[PDB]
Amino acid sequence: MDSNFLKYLSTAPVLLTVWLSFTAGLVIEANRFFPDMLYFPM
Amino acid sequence: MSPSIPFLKKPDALDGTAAGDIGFDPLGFSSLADIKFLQEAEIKHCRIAMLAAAGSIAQDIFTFPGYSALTGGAKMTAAHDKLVATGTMGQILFWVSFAEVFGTVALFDTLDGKRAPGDFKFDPLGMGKKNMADMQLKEIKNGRLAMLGIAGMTHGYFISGKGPLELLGNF
Amino acid sequence: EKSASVPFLSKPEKLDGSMAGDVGFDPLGISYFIDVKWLREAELKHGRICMLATAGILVQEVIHLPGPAFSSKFALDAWSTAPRGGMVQILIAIGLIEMVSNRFAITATDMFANPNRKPGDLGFDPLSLGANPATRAKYELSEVIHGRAAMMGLSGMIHQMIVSKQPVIDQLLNFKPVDA
Amino acid sequence: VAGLTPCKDSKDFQRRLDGSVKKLKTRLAKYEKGTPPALALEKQIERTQARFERYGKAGLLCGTDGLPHLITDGRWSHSGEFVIPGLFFLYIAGWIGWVGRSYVLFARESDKPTEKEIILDVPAALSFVSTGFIWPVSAFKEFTSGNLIADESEITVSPR
Amino acid sequence: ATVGFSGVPSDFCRPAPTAFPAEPAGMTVFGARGPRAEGHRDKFGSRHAAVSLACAALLWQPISQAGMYSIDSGSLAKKSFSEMEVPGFGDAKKVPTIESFFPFTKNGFDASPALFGKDSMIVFENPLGKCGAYASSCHTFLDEMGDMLKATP
Amino acid sequence: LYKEGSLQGKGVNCIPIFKRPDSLKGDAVGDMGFDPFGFSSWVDMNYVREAEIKHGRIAMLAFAGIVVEVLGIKAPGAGKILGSSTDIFEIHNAAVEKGSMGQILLWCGFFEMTAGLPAMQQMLEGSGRTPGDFGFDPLGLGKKDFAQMQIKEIQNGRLAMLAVSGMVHHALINGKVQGL
């Protein structure tokens, strides 16, 4: 891959969007498989 | 090449000086482990298996009074279980472990090179002063044969429920 | 100029063939951006854990420790049935083992600070089997290949157990093709 | 029990469950059986019932309104309501902050720190992200070694 | 560029020592290879670890079956050491003993000279049963492949 | 090589349809210039030669065994335990059931592990051992013409391989190993 394209992908907004999309997916899937968790189960 | 396996090269760690060394190590366990540790292990197995085989045969022939009552006529590994509940196997294991503490000390002396493998200096009757190499070869050979024999006896017992001699008399 | 494993792709530049198991297999070029020392330490840890995992999944189906808690031929069921306090104890022990074996250098910034620290060498050789230069290279290659094979085998075992819902040996002896 | 009643045995909680299920069933009555809307509403009913049952068994306390209430005082019988959740937060947040600070210093000692802050060096960033898992001991080590807290005479300040 | 995960703090602008300890070549079974104080390997070497472990096992043998054994009734009877009452300690007539360190009975574990005992014994379960790789009562993977190859639409 | 240049060696093509590959250098016994796919370029020649000898020997023994089974010659007491069936597949299944084939597998594998694997490993590490050489000449038939015996063994083993395959598939089709 072009190093210039890789630097563009390393630019701040691209990384922020990708990281926050990944985090949103993480939270969404956690809530999809373990929903309605108002508490830690103990 | 190897005297035992003509087509295979002699194992590097086997010089041939040790008793019973015929270049038999096709898988090269001597190249993995220290040969002093392996020699100690082989002599140990040899002696234990010789005692075990002679014990199987002698237990078939004769049984001490009282032990028959405690084991209810059980033989071999069933006698083992019965006498574990009895507590006799516990005493044997305690004193064998007591011996094996000093056995560990002797093993590390061997690994340090001060002691020959399997040499506990036990010869009260002085039977090894004439030809120690000859006696050592005899011991190793009989021990290997006893290892194979105790294997055969124990697995025959597992197959049939009968001791060595009882099996031979009731094949 | 070309990789040995994948002929049409070029040889990975960072893989110089010094490491055991190196066939020039790095199509995605992780080695370009991640130190090969870290990658090899990770590979060896993964392969060792998966060696033990495959051995455990295969062995604890036939031999168990005494007790109803430990009596489970199915490994995923053993995960739940085994005493939870014991499992947490194992987790804590693994943490302490990581800490001490890595000598407090457990991060990407400090793991290989000591030049003596080599990838995957944690000072573990209790019986000193690796002190022989002649067999050391063969042992290293065997360890890497074993780790790779065991990783693949453990992954397959876990997912085939998810599908079949039976142990590995039990599945192979009583196979029932997947239906929905 | 503290000042309220267990939610597993509250008529208000049961009434709320009943109302939710009845709303879903009224919405379902107008859809053919087996159609995607019917399946979706049935799954909604199942999710509601599971949520209410799990809340009941969780040991949550419920007031006269019929809704679970949280006891965030320190009581160990209600740790899972605020304390353990908050410990997980603090762990994740300290991780984020520690790795971010490490990257700030890494970029500080670079040819172009501003270029490193707008166009990131994601190999080093991922390195720090990895390091962040022992941030408590690492941060305390920084503090005690004196690499964390700056001296009063080395920080710019406005005139009085 | 930077190659991440170098493991070298100086690459990442992190604190580090300046002189790193050299790595000696010495091993202790049940121990590790690494820097140690002078004489550490000699005093606490593989010999120390192994012989100490052997002593520990020999001491475990009495401990595992710990208890007051008496033949006064005519048969060997085991009674917990907790039963004994000790004078001179006020309210505490019954005092902690070895069972406090080793609560085998409380957990329902039948210890023995060797770790496991009759009641608590390793369980060997035969996986094969009566199955066979092919042409057996059990339908194996090989059986599935043969049936599939001989199948009829 | 026996009859080098006529029976085997460089410039020998048993099937002129395909050109004698340059990789086939005429140094290996049984080299008759047949390798249309050019495997000799990449394969390990000694390993593949040992594989050929092993395949041929097993095939020869298998031909003898199948012919005796179909002819109905049985050892004293074999019929009572296994049966009187002449079909090779039924005999195989019956012997597996009784335990005969299991013991043969155990001992053949023991011989492999202790003799063939070490010998092959040393030969591939450059011991100089002739492929397929185990020193098994108790009757001393090969002392006179070892090279002639070698070529005869290789060719007979190849023919036996083809014959055994044919016999098995003939038994599958007609129920007869002959297939007549």
Ligand code: CLA
């Ligand atoms: C899903 C639930 C949830 C959500 C969405 C948020 C969201 C947020 N929390 Mg969090 N928080 C939660 C649950 C949640 N919290 C719970 C349950 C607790 C109780 C433990 C807290 C306690 C908490 C604190 C104490 C703080 C936040 C802060 C924040 C905000 C900034 C966090 C940040 O920048 O992290 C990225 C991390 C950093 C920038 C590093 C520095 C800050 C972190 C929090 C330090 C952590 C370690 C430190 C040693 C803790 C000392 C705490 C002590 C002084 C009380 C953010 C809006 C921060 C805020 O509002 O600041 C104005 C903040 O300081 N939260």
Ligand code: CLA
């Ligand atoms: C059961 C024991 C056994 C063993 C250990 C071997 C070993 C061997 N055979 Mg085999 N062979 C056996 C039985 C056995 N054979 C039997 C019963 C027959 C029929 C009578 C044959 C017929 C035969 C032929 C015709 C040929 C071989 C060949 C080979 C060699 C190459 C295969 C290899 O290295 O795979 C090892 C595995 C790998 C390299 C990677 C794959 C890993 C797999 C998946 C795992 C292997 C599991 C292992 C075999 C199980 C037993 C373990 C146990 C001994 C501890 C090797 C020396 C070939 C050769 O080159 O000979 C010189 C060859 O041409 N064998």
Ligand SMILES: CC1=C(C#C/C(C)=C/C=C/C(C)=C/C=C/C=C(C)/C=C/C=C(\C)C#CC2=C(C)C[C@@H](O)CC2(C)C)C(C)(C)C[C@H](O)C1
């Ligand atoms: C150290 C020392 C001394 C000493 C001493 C002592 C006490 C020496 C003791 C030596 C002993 C007991 C030797 C025993 C050897 C037994 C063998 C070889 C058994 C083989 C069995 C086989 C082959 C078998 C079998 C079988 C199988 C498989 C299955 C069965 O169905 C059939 C069958 C039975 C055939 C003394 C005291 C002299 C002092 C001296 O200063 C030094």
Ligand SMILES: CC1=C(C#C/C(C)=C/C=C/C(C)=C/C=C/C=C(C)/C=C/C=C(\C)C#CC2=C(C)C[C@@H](O)CC2(C)C)C(C)(C)C[C@H](O)C1
């Ligand atoms: C290092 C060291 C030591 C050591 C050591 C130790 C303890 C070494 C232990 C090594 C071990 C346990 C290795 C295990 C390897 C397992 C593998 C490769 C499994 C592969 C499975 C596959 C391919 C599969 C599969 C399958 C799947 C998925 C689908 C199934 O249908 C079929 C199947 C089952 C076939 C000691 C302690 C001696 C000290 C020494 O000083 C140093």
Ligand SMILES: CCCCCCCCCCCCO[C@H]1O[C@H](CO)[C@@H](O[C@H]2O[C@H](CO)[C@@H](O)[C@H](O)[C@H]2O)[C@H](O)[C@H]1O
């Ligand atoms: C040896 C002295 C060491 C002192 C340091 C110990 C510090 C911390 C000890 C924590 C307490 C031990 O943790 C413990 O809690 C679990 C709660 O489910 C127990 O779980 C189980 O324990 C017993 C069996 O062993 C059973 O009788 C209990 O019914 C069961 O709850 C485990 O016994 C253990 O995991």
